[PDB]
């Protein structure tokens, strides 16, 4: 008998092996996925006083340690993070309801204005010099031939009003580029950072538009504990404020449209 066709061929079983390796892969990737934000926030946890820490399937992976270079530290993941109050109040007492920011929305530090507490230290070059520093601290840097020098352009907010003028340019000493625009504010001549991401140029006019906030809001830009360098804490703090204006800076960004 030389014809007993087997119903099982290498192609079936290779498709079997694959799916098994697959499932293990998926599972694993979802585990690396819980090295942050976990366990979750329910009132399942609060109701039970915490006896239901929310982690789901799969579960959380044993911590991993990152050894920052330069006497920098050591970070772990997953970690235990201290809760932080919410600077807002429930739009409804029902769960899943959004919260309204407390007080003046741009000040709230809630919503598009919220942000975490990153180190109060500076990111560093390879050598260990403050990575992000101004061109005034980073002597070498230079505009690229054929690019308007931002230095001296007028910074202008979302409504038209002048905001200030570019007093300097902050650069990456690691990957040479403009990261932050410095702004001598008109209303008080204080110096603030302006993330490049929020800034549009109008080279033919030497203006630097900013849809984010109004010219006035530039007065409240979060500040630097040193005008010649900036910490991780301070960057988030700077940007999130402008970001808040995307939903706050006007009595209309709140939406609807209809």
């Amino acid at each position: 008998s030389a014809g007993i066709t087997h119903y099982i061929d290498a192609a079936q079983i290779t498709i079997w092996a694959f799916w098994l390796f697959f499932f293990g892969l998926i599972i694993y990737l979802r585990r690396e996925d819980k090295r942050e934000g976990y366990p979750l926030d329910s009132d399942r946890t609060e109701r039970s006083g915490g006896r239901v820490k929310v982690v789901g399937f799969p579960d959380l992976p044993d911590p991993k340690t990152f050894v920052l270079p330069h006497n920098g530290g050591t970070v772990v993941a997953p970690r235990v993070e201290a809760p932080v109050a919410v600077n807002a109040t429930p739009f409804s007492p029902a769960p899943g309801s959004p919260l309204v920011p407390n007080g003046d929305p741009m000040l709230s530090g809630f919503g598009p204005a919220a942000s975490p507490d990153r180190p109060k230290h500076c990111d560093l070059t390879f050598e260990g010099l403050p990575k992000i520093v101004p061109m005034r601290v980073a002597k070498e840097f230079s505009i690229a031939e054929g690019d308007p020098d931002p230095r001296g352009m007028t910074v202008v907010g979302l409504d038209g009003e002048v905001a200030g003028t570019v007093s300097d340019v902050w650069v990456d000493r690691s990957e040479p580029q403009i990261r932050y625009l410095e702004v001598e504010v008109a209303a008080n001549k204080k110096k603030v950072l302006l993330p490049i991401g929020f800034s549009r140029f109008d080279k033919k006019a030497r203006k630097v538009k900013v849809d984010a906030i109004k010219a006035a809001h530039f007065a409240n830009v979060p500040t630097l504990s040193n005008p010649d360098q900036v910490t991780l804490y301070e960057e988030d703090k700077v940007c999130a404020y402008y970001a808040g204006g995307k939903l706050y800076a006007t009595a209309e960004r709140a939406g609807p449209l209809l």
């Binding site: 007993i4 087997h6 119903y7 099982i8 290498a10 092996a17």
Partner: protein
């Protein structure tokens, strides 16, 4: 049982936890592979009609 004697010192070099799990995996796998090798050869024992054919227990 090394078989003599300072070949224990090998676990002074290669993490015992890692070596163990490694072997567990390697075997748990190899078993599946060779099983499949046997399933496609003369040593196959399932789609053989051994010792009496089962799809000819009725018709299909």
């Amino acid at each position: 049982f090394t078989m003599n004697a300072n070949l224990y010192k090998i676990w002074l070099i290669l993490d015992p936890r890692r070596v163990l799990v490694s072997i567990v995996a390697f075997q748990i796998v190899l078993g599946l592979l060779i099983h499949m090798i046997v399933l496609s050869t003369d040593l196959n024992w399932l789609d053989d009609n051994i010792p009496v054919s089962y799809q000819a227990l009725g018709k299909k």
